[PDB]
Design a binder for this molecule. Sequence first.
Ligand SMILES: *[C@@H]1O[C@H](CO)[C@@H](O)[C@H](O)[C@H]1NC(C)=O
Ligand SMILES: *[C@@H]1O[C@H](CO)[C@@H](O)[C@H](O)[C@H]1NC(C)=O
Ligand SMILES: *[C@@H]1O[C@H](CO)[C@@H](O)[C@H](O)[C@H]1NC(C)=O
Ligand SMILES: *P(=O)(O)Oc1ccccc1C
Ligand SMILES: *P(=O)(O)Oc1ccccc1C
Lengths: 542, 539
Amino acid sequence: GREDPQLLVRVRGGQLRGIRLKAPGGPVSAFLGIPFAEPPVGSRRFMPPEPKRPWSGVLDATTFQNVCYQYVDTLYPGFEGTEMWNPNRELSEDCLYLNVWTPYPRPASPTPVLIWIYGGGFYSGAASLDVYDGRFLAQVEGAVLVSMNYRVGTFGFLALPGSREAPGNVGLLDQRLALQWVQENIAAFGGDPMSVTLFGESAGAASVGMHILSLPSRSLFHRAVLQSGTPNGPWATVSAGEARRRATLLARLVGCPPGGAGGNDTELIACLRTRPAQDLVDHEWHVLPQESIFRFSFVPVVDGDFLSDTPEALINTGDFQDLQVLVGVVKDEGSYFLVYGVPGFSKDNESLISRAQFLAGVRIGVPQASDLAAEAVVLHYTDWLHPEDPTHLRDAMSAVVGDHNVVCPVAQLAGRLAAQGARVYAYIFEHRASTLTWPLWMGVPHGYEIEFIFGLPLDPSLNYTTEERIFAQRLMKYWTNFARTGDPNDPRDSKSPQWPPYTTAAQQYVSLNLKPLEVRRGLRAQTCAFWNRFLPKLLSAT
Amino acid sequence: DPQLLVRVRGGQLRGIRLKAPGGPVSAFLGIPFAEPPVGSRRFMPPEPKRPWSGVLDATTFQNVCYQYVDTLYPGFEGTEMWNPNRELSEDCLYLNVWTPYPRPASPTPVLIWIYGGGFYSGAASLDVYDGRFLAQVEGAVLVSMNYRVGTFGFLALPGSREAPGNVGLLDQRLALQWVQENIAAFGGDPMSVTLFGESAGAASVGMHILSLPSRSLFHRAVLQSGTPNGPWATVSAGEARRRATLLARLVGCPPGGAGGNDTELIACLRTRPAQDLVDHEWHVLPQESIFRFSFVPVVDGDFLSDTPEALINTGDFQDLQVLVGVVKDEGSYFLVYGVPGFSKDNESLISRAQFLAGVRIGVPQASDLAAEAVVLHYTDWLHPEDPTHLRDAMSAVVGDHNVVCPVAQLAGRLAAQGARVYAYIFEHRASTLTWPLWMGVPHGYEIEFIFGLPLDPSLNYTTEERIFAQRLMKYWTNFARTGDPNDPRDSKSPQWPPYTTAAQQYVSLNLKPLEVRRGLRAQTCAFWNRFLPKLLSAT
Ligand SMILES: *[C@@H]1O[C@H](CO)[C@@H](O)[C@H](O)[C@H]1NC(C)=O
Ligand SMILES: *[C@@H]1O[C@H](CO)[C@@H](O)[C@H](O)[C@H]1NC(C)=O
Ligand SMILES: *[C@@H]1O[C@H](CO)[C@@H](O)[C@H](O)[C@H]1NC(C)=O
Ligand SMILES: *P(=O)(O)Oc1ccccc1C
Ligand SMILES: *P(=O)(O)Oc1ccccc1C
């Protein structure tokens, strides 16, 4: 005896025992740190994941595993806003492990599965973080939730395209591997391989999109949720040549020609593979082209392999009838990245800024924009009746960053997926958390709908308001509804009023906030026509 | 009759007594201000009228300057009203003076009118320019002159003795020096002179403002739906020469293409029938266009020392009072002149592709990219195909480009240079309007009201319309005397605030009482004035 049959599971690779957690409502079963891949260390660094070699004995799934090696953000030390995101377990090169939450006892019927891919800009993050805790969706919505670690940073994305040694997108491959893993083993946990919804946020949402666009990933999941990020758009992909440039430059920086050499690839990677992980982490930021924000050093490369063409091309020409996606943004996307190096912007004060500061800002936030590309931006975003207004200027600059990296690319992906015949639902998330740390001017900043999606307000010890608790429940029901049926709507019910599909014609999306749903038509339409349609033609012939 | 006979350093004049609703008026019509620029004097700066003996007949309107007669909508009051109401002749230079009956108490302020019509047409002889209501009602001495138009006024071979260019403007200026010498005898004040004009006329007003010798001939100025700056009001010396050369080439000149001296080319041009010049006049335009007329003022380095842009940018405006403004829908009137899909008959709902090409037409100097910019700007992207919007938006494109944004730019530039400026937007559509309603308050229809035409009972205006008319005449004349549109005492109005670069206050002229808005355009005018030029270069 002594073995709870609910916590014992035999998956393809061996036996693991999980742990019983107390969620507020009931208990839940958590299986944590299940290795989905042989550790990519030593000679396996920069390389696609080999799948986990099988193990005898019973593996211990009772606890979270190491976080993939990453930059730990030092901006505002000891500050909840920045540090919620920072690694909560020990950094290792051996990070590829996944987590599964299910109801207790393990579900009778094959419940649909939600796979969560985290964000953090492909330089950072981990499934261990408190906001991604699957316990509440498991308990309340009776769902089965998976989250995998993927290599971030140089280890995940450093690429010397066309080489066997550092092929690129190995992080995205980690993700896909874990997707396969869900296919092979999830039913053992009470999951339903026939229904799999990928959902992610920021870089993570971009990852989701990338799996939509890559054929080998399409066979593993049936539905997608992109929250505040897209595969198209300025920040999420790089030219193969750019990636190569950045790689050989970082190589130079860590003293790995060695000595002024560096023509032979295999030789260069093989040298890079000797330097201690933390040195690579210390240097990954120096390779960037410009003084910029919302631009990351090592990201998915367009290799003609994982991404066969650019996501632009791909979403333009694809066939999406198989597919239903739920996509949306939060109310102020820009404000977070502002304190990250547009001058004038702090969390510690109201951040009113001069005009010169606004202009300078526009150069920083739209870094690849020439003059007149940028003068176009300024013309569009200035209030010309009151061009010097510091409040307006501030709010403007926020909106510029937000619109350029998030809202207009989300709008473009929605429009195209719809036109390509997919069921698309769209949302703007407008509720500011009562628990929120960052100052008032930053609004409902990037990433702060997450904790409401995972139903953290359902935890009483966390100091949310009862209205937020109800709200959080309502979101959970939307998401697990989409997961289950491909529609966010409450199926039996007709009310509040129901949430309509985003279409190319009507373009309806809804507002997610404390009030019930209202339907808004067109999503930053004129502005996105500028960003998506006009501005490309501009800096393109500048 | 005592008043009907007046002296005028050129010699004796006999006026005529006329009936305004509220009094009599002494009307003197067809006073020659220059010896007729016919024959060898065609294309040449006007020489002043040589004096005469005898009592000259001022009792009727003289000839209209030789011009294209609009054939578009036969017998339609709307287009017809701008056509010549007198006979066409190259001997057209005669002005018109209105005094009340009797002659003055003290010297009264003077209002000089310069007509619109695109430099390709016009006359003071026109109906809506009826000068008497302002005279009788507001006690104003009101002058209106004919200046040369079309090739005769503006054809230039810049640098040439015999076709210097801007001679139509010189006709205006000379009319002004005649008013500076001779208006006194009509009981007008030579030290109060307020030039007001509409459209091309407005452009001429600003044109005098910018021209140095013109400066001493006036005091205040009203610009109605036109500016000296902008897309349509001037050409380069280069393009002037280009067009003159081509038009010559379309009629005989120079004979069989011997090339060479401009003197012989102009000499040859002088011997063609006036109607021939008019016939081939419309062929010399570079592209297909809506605004954009063939022969206009030219920046010669003489009448304008630099381009109007440069002059309103560096100009010192210290003592200047200007009343500028636009009507509600400017562009509408023009669209039926050859943007496809626009008639006065059908209500002109258009396709998207129609709009797309219409943009190419009304902003002809735009490259593909500048066009893409204009479309992106004026398209409602939530409903890109909606015909009603596409139509109204095309009217807005043509209007904003050719009039509104120019007007705003001049306003702000004049304010920044220390001029007192009053801006107005005219919201009221006359009931007597023969044009379809989709054209709103079309270009040039605020003239009926400024000239006090609703005070004429037999014209069928509404009553609030004539109280409106009286309002407007009070406005304009108050500006004439003061250099300020308001009442000296009465408050009311509510006060019409000076347009400044900061506040940007402009007023609404409506039947309902005075309203103050801020930011005439701005967004949309920063496009046109700041950005689009940067984009017209590099593309
Ligand atoms: C690349 O050059 C190295 C020597 O630096 C050599 O050992 C290796 O075999 C070469 N491989 C290729 C790609 O030719
Ligand atoms: C041009 O030709 C005519 C011939 O009548 C002459 O009077 C004139 O002076 C000539 N010379 C030039 C180049 O002006
Ligand atoms: C509206 O009328 C005009 C003139 O008759 C014509 O150019 C236009 O095509 C008409 N609109 C349509 C498409 O019915
Ligand atoms: P994106 O990948 O930019 O999302 C981020 C980035 C940094 C910190 C938190 C989050 C959600
Ligand atoms: P502008 O000179 O364009 O003014 C016009 C033009 C044609 C007809 C009437 C008017 C007032």
